[PDB]
Design a protein around this ligand. Sequence first.
Ligand SMILES: OC[C@H]1O[C@H](O)[C@@H](O)[C@@H](O)[C@@H]1O
Length: 94
Amino acid sequence: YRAIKGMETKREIGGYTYKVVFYENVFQDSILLGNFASQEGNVLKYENGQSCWNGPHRSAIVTVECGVENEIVSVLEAQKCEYLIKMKSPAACS
Ligand SMILES: OC[C@H]1O[C@H](O)[C@@H](O)[C@@H](O)[C@@H]1O
């Protein structure tokens, strides 16, 4: 997984610097969103992030689809401290 473990993509969204590191962790500024737990298809689950006022400990579901360059396409926090992150990356290509 070593051709992609540790690969980092960053994007500023809404003032936050989001940082996804494949098979390691996800951060929002200095806050841990989750550590890599499992993968099903293109979907990487990151779990057990930092505690959240009036919410769950943070987690992030990162969907990585084939593209020519690493990119964080969107971050959605529909439920408090549950992050849905869509990405493109050559890691997800044939
Ligand atoms: O107060 C909870 C709030 O804290 C920070 O803003 C960020 O981690 C947000 O994503 C989260 O919703």
